[PDB]
């Protein structure tokens, strides 16, 4: 009886492939031939943040575009004032093996997690004046890879148990569970409207998840290796992913297929983080080769290189206003570029 | 602007407090040597953890040797996919890999352990991480070899051609067959580790039992040797 279902599954996959091929009337590169190239893009270090003892693995920009939260595997979740470089807070994490951090849109709460199976929520402005764990989210059976706040009460978290979950901070329960992924989920990206989010996994596939319906609306399998990063296009109709492929790929939700691929011969190492500028024209991705390559989202060419890191670049983030891009690396330093 | 200057002064005071706290934290952190404990589920890793101590994803044990603090992390409640979360332990002083040497025939878990050791050794991010190889369950291996239940001759056909190294130092009263099997198992891992030939990291095999009381001393000696070798290589002495 098992084999009978597999013929159905293969026929469905072939039908999806045929539909995607039919919808591929023209490629993005061909239509993009007659647009003005972006040209040379140059950026150098503007602010150097120091104080982390171990390798930095995750970071996130605040909504104000001035506060920065960085997570290091030494057990410190430091909050930095980018404009003045001052360290607003230095939160000592219960578990030193933190693999993710998130800044709430209102800035009232900060989340983090890692190998401890627990996504800790920290309140920054408690009336007592100190920073303390508002509540710890537990229930995962893997390693927390990424997390992002939908609101001050709802947070989406990704874990190494191959499932993503939506948590209610007030009650600490899982509002919904996402189990469509087969491999380890590595990154999350919330849409501008927060209605849908895309999660990359080690199964070399990206899935578009509906927050309320608790299901994947679409699945993408453009990449051939583990997907480490994912980021929505600013309009929310497309997203880009980073993987061990050493290449970046762009997907559109409406087209339900890959649009563009960013690759180059001299690049053979994996990709850790990816982000989009405010306009979405520039695609910035972090690489294991200790430098970040700026890719034109349309021309499929490298516009600039950020080689101001002495170790693996593990995270990347662009301010909401797009003024500057901050990159973290294993060298325990954060570089802000403009 | 007076309000702005007051705000900057408050931010600078907070920065100074945070820097003092981070300096103290750096001082305490540098004094600690982090270790990663790995091994098969059927291995004596749990027994070793219990001896050293005497569903969270990471279990940490505190133990001190010669007034030197060590943090050993046991990766539990984690899926068998290790290629991702293993990268978090690139900066650990050493990786204590526990292998059930007697599991050469009980599916042969020894081959799986060898493959895992090879993957750890050849990882790009673990090139600078030394591995402390604990060949656990030596008593069971010796009992099985003496009792005749051992069939490693066909499981590992290289055993027939293999011979006991002259450098071997068998314990008193140890049967020649037991020594031969032990050193063959050790050389199986030495082949993988010696293959790199880079000198950035080294393997430290040890014949240990589940309830061995010298495991802490072995770990301390391995860490000291690793640090000494790193310093010597830095000064072109190795």
């Amino acid at each position: 009886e098992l084999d009978q279902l597999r013929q159905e599954a293969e026929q469905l996959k072939n039908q999806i492939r045929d539909a995607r091929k039919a919808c591929a009337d023209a490629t993005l590169s061909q239509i993009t031939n007659n647009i003005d190239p972006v040209g040379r893009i140059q950026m150098r270090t503007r602010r150097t943040l120091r104080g982390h003892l171990a390798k930095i693995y995750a970071m996130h920009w605040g909504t104000d575009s001035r506060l920065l939260v960085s997570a290091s595997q030494d057990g410190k979740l430091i909050i930095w004032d980018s404009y003045t470089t001052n360290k607003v807070h230095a939160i000592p994490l219960r578990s030193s093996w933190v693999m993710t951090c998130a800044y709430a849109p209102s800035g009232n709460y900060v989340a983090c997690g890692g190998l401890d199976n627990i996504c800790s929520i920290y309140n920054l402005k408690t009336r007592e004046g100190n920073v303390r764990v508002s509540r710890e989210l537990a229930g995962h059976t893997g390693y927390l890879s990424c997390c992002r706040f939908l609101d001050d009460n709802q947070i989406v978290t990704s874990s190494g148990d191959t499932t993503c979950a939506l948590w209610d901070i007030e009650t600490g329960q899982q509002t919904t569970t996402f189990t469509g992924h087969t491999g380890d989920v590595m990154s999350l990206s919330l849409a501008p409207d927060t209605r849908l989010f895309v999660s990359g996994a080690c199964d070399a596939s990206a899935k578009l998840w509906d927050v309320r319906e608790g299901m994947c609306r679409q699945t993408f399998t453009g990449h051939e290796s583990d997907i480490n990063a994912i980021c929505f296009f600013p309009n929310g109709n497309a997203f880009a992913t980073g993987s061990d492929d050493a290449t970046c790929r762009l997907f559109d939700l409406r087209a339900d297929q890959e649009l563009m691929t960013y690759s180059h011969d001299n690049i053979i190492c994996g990709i850790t983080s990816v982000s989009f500028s405010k306009s979405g024209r520039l695609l910035l991705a972090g690489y294991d080769d200790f430098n970040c390559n700026v890719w034109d989202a349309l021309k499929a060419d490298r516009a600039g290189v950020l080689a101001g890191h002495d170790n693996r670049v593990s995270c990347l983030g662009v301010t909401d206003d797009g003024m500057a891009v901050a990159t973290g690396s294993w060298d325990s330093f954060l570089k802000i570029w403009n | 602007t007076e309000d702005q200057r007051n705000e900057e002064k408050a931010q600078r005071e907070a920065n100074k407090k945070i820097e003092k706290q981070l300096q103290k934290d750096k001082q305490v952190y540098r004094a600690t040597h982090r270790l990663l404990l790995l091994g098969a589920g059927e291995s004596g890793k749990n027994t070793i953890v219990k001896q050293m101590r005497i569903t969270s994803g990471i279990f940490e044990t505190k133990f001190q040797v010669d007034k030197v603090n060590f943090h050993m992390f046991d990766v539990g409640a984690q899926r068998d996919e290790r290629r991702k979360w293993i990268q978090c332990f690139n900066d650990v002083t050493a990786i204590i890999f526990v292998v059930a040497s007697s599991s050469y025939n009980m599916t042969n878990r020894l081959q799986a352990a060898l493959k895992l050791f090879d993957s750890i050794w050849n990882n790009k991010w673990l090139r600078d991480t030394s591995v402390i190889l604990f060949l656990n369950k030596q008593d069971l291996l010796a009992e099985k070899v003496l009792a005749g239940k051992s069939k490693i001759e066909d499981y590992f056909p290289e055993f027939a051609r293999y011979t006991t190294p002259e450098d071997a130092t068998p314990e008193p009263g140890e049967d020649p067959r037991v020594t031969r099997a032990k050193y063959f198992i050790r050389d199986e891992f030495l082949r993988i580790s010696t293959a790199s030939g880079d000198g950035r990291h080294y393997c430290y095999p040890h014949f240990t039992c589940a309830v061995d009381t010298e495991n802490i001393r072995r770990v301390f000696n391995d860490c000291r040797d690793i640090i000494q070798r790193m310093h010597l290589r830095q000064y072109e002495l190795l």
Epitope: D245 | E81, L116
Partner: nanobody, 128 residues
Framework: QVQLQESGGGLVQPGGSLRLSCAAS????????MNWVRQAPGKGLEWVSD????????SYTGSVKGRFTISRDNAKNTLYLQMNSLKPEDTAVYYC?????????????????????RGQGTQVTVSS
Amino acid sequence: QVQLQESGGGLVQPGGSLRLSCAASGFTFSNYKMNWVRQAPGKGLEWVSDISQSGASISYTGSVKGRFTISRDNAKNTLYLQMNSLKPEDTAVYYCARCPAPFTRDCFDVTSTTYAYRGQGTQVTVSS
């Protein structure tokens, strides 16, 4: 889409010979080390053999070296495993496994319970 498929199998008397074919598509075959793993009835997944990207380096498990032979063809995007002198205990589903990442010597999770880059395999039975 990373897809791996196998061909060949069926009932074979002990001491016979069989050849497995692994059809790979959706990824650059030449940039990934390939592996063969098997899962006997009621037992866990056991690694069998591996082939380097260029095929120059070859290794087999202790109970398989010499008896079997692994070969790859980067031009046709196919991998082969010449199963010669099958033993009765060799009966198992042989999976054509790909390493998680290209250019990396480490191949950690080929034997994992729920690996994603594995070939699903064909049942092999060795009996009279």
